[PDB]
Amino acid sequence: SLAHTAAEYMLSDLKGLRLELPLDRIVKFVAVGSPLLLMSLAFAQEFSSGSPISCFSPSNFSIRQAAYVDSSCWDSLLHHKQDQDKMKSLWPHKALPYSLLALALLMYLPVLLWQYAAVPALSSDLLFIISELDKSYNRSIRLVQHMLKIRQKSSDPYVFWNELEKARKERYFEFPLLERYLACKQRSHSLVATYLLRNSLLLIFTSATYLYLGHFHLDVFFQEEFSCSIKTGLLSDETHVPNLITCRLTSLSIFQIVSLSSVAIYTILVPVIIYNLTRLCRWDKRLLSVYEMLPAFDLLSRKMLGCPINDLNVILLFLRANISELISFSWLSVLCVLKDHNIDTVVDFMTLLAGLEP
Amino acid sequence: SLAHTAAEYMLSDLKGLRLELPLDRIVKFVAVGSPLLLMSLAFAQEFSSGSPISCFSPSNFSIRQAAYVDSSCWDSLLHHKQDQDKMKSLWPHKALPYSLLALALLMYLPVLLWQYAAVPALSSDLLFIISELDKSYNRSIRLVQHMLKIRQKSSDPYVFWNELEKARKERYFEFPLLERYLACKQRSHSLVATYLLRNSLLLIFTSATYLYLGHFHLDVFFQEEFSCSIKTGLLSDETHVPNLITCRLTSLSIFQIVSLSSVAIYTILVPVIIYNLTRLCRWDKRLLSVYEMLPAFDLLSRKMLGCPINDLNVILLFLRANISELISFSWLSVLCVLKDHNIDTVVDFMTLLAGLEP
Amino acid sequence: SLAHTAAEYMLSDLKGLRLELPLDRIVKFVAVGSPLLLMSLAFAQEFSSGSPISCFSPSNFSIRQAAYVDSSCWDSLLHHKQDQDKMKSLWPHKALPYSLLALALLMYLPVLLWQYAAVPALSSDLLFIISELDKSYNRSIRLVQHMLKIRQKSSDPYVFWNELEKARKERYFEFPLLERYLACKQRSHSLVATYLLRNSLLLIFTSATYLYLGHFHLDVFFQEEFSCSIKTGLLSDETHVPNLITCRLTSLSIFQIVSLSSVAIYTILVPVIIYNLTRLCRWDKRLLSVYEMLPAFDLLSRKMLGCPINDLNVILLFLRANISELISFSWLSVLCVLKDHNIDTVVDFMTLLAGLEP
Amino acid sequence: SLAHTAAEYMLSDLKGLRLELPLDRIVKFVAVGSPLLLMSLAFAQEFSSGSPISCFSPSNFSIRQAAYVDSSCWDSLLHHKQDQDKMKSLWPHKALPYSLLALALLMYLPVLLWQYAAVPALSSDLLFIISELDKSYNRSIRLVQHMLKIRQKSSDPYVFWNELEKARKERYFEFPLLERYLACKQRSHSLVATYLLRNSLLLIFTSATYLYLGHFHLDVFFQEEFSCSIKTGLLSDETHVPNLITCRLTSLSIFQIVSLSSVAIYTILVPVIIYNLTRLCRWDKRLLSVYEMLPAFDLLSRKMLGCPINDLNVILLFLRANISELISFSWLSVLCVLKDHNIDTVVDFMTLLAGLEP
Amino acid sequence: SLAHTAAEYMLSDLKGLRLELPLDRIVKFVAVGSPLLLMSLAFAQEFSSGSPISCFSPSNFSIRQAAYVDSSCWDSLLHHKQDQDKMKSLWPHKALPYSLLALALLMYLPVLLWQYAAVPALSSDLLFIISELDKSYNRSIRLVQHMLKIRQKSSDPYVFWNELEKARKERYFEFPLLERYLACKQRSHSLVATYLLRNSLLLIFTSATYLYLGHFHLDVFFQEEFSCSIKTGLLSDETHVPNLITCRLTSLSIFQIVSLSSVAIYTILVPVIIYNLTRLCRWDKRLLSVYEMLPAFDLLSRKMLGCPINDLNVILLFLRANISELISFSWLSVLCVLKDHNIDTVVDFMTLLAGLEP
């Protein structure tokens, strides 16, 4: 089947950076591969359907005539009801695999949009910010270590309350480029629109799937027998049955199971996209208390004001996920013992030099 | 079949850390791959079922009419007993492969939950604690070796009972950051909840499987013949048999074997998960006798008090599994000769420099 | 099917250069792989047609005679209408897969033309230009840095308005070979012709596909029954039906769906090619503001005059996509803070020295 | 077939250590792969059975009625003998592939038990003992070579009978840690239990296979015809044959051959497991003559007393197979010329220094 | 077919040594793969037999009755001759593929025995002997080269007939360990028994094949028709033919061709095994003329006396094949110009110094 190749080519699992949150990956897999799995199950493997239609032809008919009767009614699905002459069509039975493939292809568009319209700029931004932030280790331990060393040589105000301004407001301690970069990027609104579009496209496609299932299905759902006609053309001048009644749809159970599964999967999936969209509506300040003490990380928590819908919010969201790669996967993560005003400031310091790395 | 590719994708066997206990791996394998193997055996390979239903149609019927009769009763499994007209359905026969696939997918949820909600924090904690612990070798032999060398130069109380407090309680012999980390982690209760949920979900799913087998199976278990009706629609005004009796379920033996195997495997599996759950209800002090003497390993055995349901218990449980990698796969493991108060300590030190490694 | 092998061989995704824009790659993929996917879906996988024609032969005919009837009318598709004797032919039904393969092969010609006639020269020019531009970093910070160092030692006109001419118009600040190369390349009109031909070929082929679908299809589109004759030769002196009416085309739905999809995909694809063609109708001056201070990048923005249809336009278009590889993926890209006459020049300089790379 | 996949996954042929003896590997190969090979040969490849049952239905029956008759008796194997009405069943014919797969899976349990309960401790012990033993080379030639170079300078008792005690009982010639390790491991009894259980499980499974073949087979062994009944239910009120006699089992020869081969292979395999079990009931002193002279190897030959059943026996058995890896695959192995009291002691020495390796 | 997999796994073509002679490899290949090739050709590919038996049932019989007839005679091959009632069986027709597979498996036993019982010791001996022989180069050119250099400084008896005793009988010239090793290995008789058993097993298996072909074949060889009986059980009380004559064996030609080819191939193969066995009945002295002049190679030719059935004979036989690897694949092989008493020795020496390698 084409499902295996489709799942092999698409939905298949810089140089170290992570550009996709785990929840988005789970959503993408469970939203793209699910129709492929359904179509693979329905028309392959276990249920060898064979012919999806069976006809009760008269016994006078030969084998080839019966084959003609049962092959000219699969592509002409029309219920010739006696109630005038409303030939209700049963085309979803024939179009189900096409619809599943079309839905699977449609659900892949936001992924391409994200990879083509937002990955490069965000990758460049993250690379610059990590390259700048990796310099903040040897700036509070390599530069400020002459704080507790001189603290024991003096007492109080001019050793731990008057020098914290002559050293913090110093040339080697300041990062003007990063502050200007963050200030300029906070005003931007270009890459937040890609996130919003990526979520909204999935929401709209789910709504369209609901409309398709509620309008075309759910009507031919308990209908399994329909009466056709063959003498509707050049065969009208022949002596045989004018209404070849009781053509049966063999695969009705697969139809119902696929419809119910398609409804349930997306019903379960709906709130996750809403939560993902909501994630960008608030300023995350879980570990801000630690962030405001380190030199470079102070600026990250400083610019948290106003409307949270900016480029900075998405940059921070993608920054917290990459903050544990190999080098910040260190003291910063280890500093969970400092989450519990003259003793607090010292206790934060011999914690720093204990993890002096080499 | 699809079971082969499902087993190839899922259930397939940092950079050195072991984050899964062997019994958990065994349980996951035997709980996920079992329904897939049952599905592969039941509907492929050896037993080429062909058609799962056979009908005794009248000899007047043609080949196509008999095919219609036997194909319109597989998707309409309804026993028209004369006992009013209680049409009992035999839908488990048709739904067995779907149920097996659903169970296989359901058993994989706790694995994803553990891999997504507990692996990163546990990996970080293990990496930090291992990095702190690997420094304990050159602190009891490279620092304390000037004890027995001094012992031969004097006698008793001031040579082997007075400096054990001046040297053990020294700046180079203390690990304050690790002690604070362990104290902070003992209070936490986040990572143990993931373990408890991972085991409880498996127990709940086993109970659900038992309920499914006891309610829907075990009723159609010794029934192999049912009588159907075809004249229940547009075929009513036709002259043929109104009760096409004796439709035989050809694959009843496969049904019974699959049900019995599914019962037995999970009955065997039940106590292992309970043992895994109870593994966290006690403080394991099997090797605490040797740990207390080491400088850094002393803190691990010191903080074994109170309720054993903490994050420290899980961290220790996962730590004993990685304590034999390549460098702690050493004297620590070789210290099996100290499992049998002035001669005991000197023997414990004579053993120490024997494994001087270089 | 041959579709899988064809998609494997063709459409299969120096040493670092990007010689194809992403939009061109998307257009090529969509325009080439779509007919292959349609051919794979229509004549394989889901819809197993078997015999695309069915016949209503008389009951006197044997099995072999009926097979002869239904096999001698597939290769002689002629509707013997009674309206003289205008025997309309239905050859597109037979020729559809051939047409799809021919279209798939035809759409691959522009890619071959671009790869054979324009890739080497463009690669040569891009390599030379990138090599020359890479030397521009240590020529504004390693050469001009004695500007603000001297600026603090003096005041205004002879320190920041008279030295900007004695330093910019200096031997080490000139790249005369690169100016001559760009001047000579601006006069050339060879490589733009390949681009224009590559797009025009795709437009012409799309028009040809429209003509083919409009003239040969859309006529046999709602016709499913045709009456043939077998006594048109050596069988004329026999006693059997002279007009063997009601030969049915089984796969008419596949025909209609394939035609509609082929129309829709190319209708969607048309405007993208026009946008690509019009991309060369203007001089791109988006980031010319920051190019005009840098030493070597000044020449690129200087030569933007006259008609925009030159080789330099294509060179710049392909250079912009390659300007963020590993080394120019630096301060140049980070210079997003200089997109908002004495303070402006000094602000642009202290930013330059802050990103001093090593 | 599942046989190929099973043989590929299971039964598939640190970093240098040999943890499985060749005889155990051969036994595992023969005991695991043989049922898989028998199942692959029997129900695939050469003998394409098709339908394993054939029935002599009356000529009045149609094709579909005959198919019903011959398909409703494969799953209802009951011999309605006229001798009351002792309907003897023939379920082994249907259950043979399940039995073969179950035996193949059952024979794999001891391998898992040995790999999970004994490999790590044995590997650790082997690593430590080998790392201690490889040091014995430069301790009998780099330390005791001042025995013949002084022998020529003196004569007899104080040069070759009084120096062998002042040098052998010297600090550099002792291995106290290894001696204590061996003494502690001799008292243990944990590793021998895994060996004994691993062999006893195979013996028990062979006995179970014998019981299964003797109780269920060997009764239906020469029976090839049985008479069934179809009118045992809703078909009882019908006019046709009540005893559809002579249903023939087509694959009886495969049954007989598989049973005989299964008996023969395990009958041949039985004594090897017994030999492996008794391998541990004696102290191996084949090369103790050359071991008692080397410094480190003296301890291995010293501790051969008491009951053979202990952990040191298993350690020595696994160590003799690894003593020829790359470094002890040397003079130790080359010392085959010493296998034939003042001449023997000296003659043994210039053999040692001649193989001085560098 | 299983033949392809069997040929892939078994019969598939330290670290440099050659432990098998080319003739042994050829014999093993042509003795193991020949039955596999015969079984692959006979029951697959070109000659699609289909059903190996055809029956002439009466025209009154139906299709299913004829299928029962031809299926109940393949597993009951018994010629009910009228000559009492000596029912001769034709089981070789059914058992031929089993016999070919069993022969292929049986012929692999000597290879396994040789690999398991003789390869390691032979490898160790070859490694030691080659390592000792590799030192013989810089012992006749780097040591004795002061012979012709001093020969020109003197004349005859005390320069080239009295110095050939003070130089060859010197400490640096002698090889005592190698001489003792060869003397000890000459007395050994262990590894020659493995060679003799390896050849004798093949001879015995060829004799068994001859007996099997001459006893069971060659009797049913020109018989292609046999008459069966079906009324020999529960069908005896029926009105149909009681001697169902002319059941024909379709694949008799394949039977005859396979038998003749199997006879001929092993008839051709027999004398090669005899030649290989007789290879060890003599001392090979082809190049002993050049061996006796070299320092280390003299000992190899010295110990050639008595019964040639020893371990030394096989060691030399396998050393001749391995002596041309990379280093002895030199002057030793080049010394072919010296195979044609005062001038012979000086010519033999000036040839040695010309091949000085560096």
mmCIF file of C-alpha atoms in Angstrom, chain C residues 7 10 13 86 129 133 141 150-151 172 184 236-237 239 254 256 270-271 274 282 286 310 347:
data_model
loop_
_atom_site.group_PDB
_atom_site.id
_atom_site.type_symbol
_atom_site.label_atom_id
_atom_site.label_comp_id
_atom_site.label_asym_id
_atom_site.label_seq_id
_atom_site.Cartn_x
_atom_site.Cartn_y
_atom_site.Cartn_z
ATOM 1 C CA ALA C 7 10.492 8.791 -8.637
ATOM 2 C CA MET C 10 14.789 11.324 -11.000
ATOM 3 C CA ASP C 13 17.255 15.026 -3.101
ATOM 4 C CA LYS C 86 -19.523 8.158 -37.166
ATOM 5 C CA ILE C 129 32.851 36.210 -5.155
ATOM 6 C CA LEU C 133 34.035 38.783 0.181
ATOM 7 C CA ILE C 141 37.808 46.145 12.234
ATOM 8 C CA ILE C 150 41.972 58.437 17.646
ATOM 9 C CA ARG C 151 38.522 60.063 17.935
ATOM 10 C CA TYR C 172 44.487 48.278 1.440
ATOM 11 C CA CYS C 184 32.303 42.732 -16.583
ATOM 12 C CA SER C 236 -18.876 -11.277 -40.878
ATOM 13 C CA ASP C 237 -20.234 -14.552 -42.308
ATOM 14 C CA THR C 239 -24.617 -16.067 -37.038
ATOM 15 C CA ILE C 254 -10.621 7.065 -11.866
ATOM 16 C CA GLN C 256 -12.589 11.772 -13.944
ATOM 17 C CA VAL C 270 0.803 28.541 -12.283
ATOM 18 C CA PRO C 271 1.217 31.776 -10.215
ATOM 19 C CA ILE C 274 5.137 33.796 -12.683
ATOM 20 C CA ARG C 282 13.570 44.654 -10.078
ATOM 21 C CA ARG C 286 16.169 45.502 1.102
ATOM 22 C CA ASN C 310 21.619 41.218 -16.120
ATOM 23 C CA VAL C 347 27.426 53.857 16.862
#
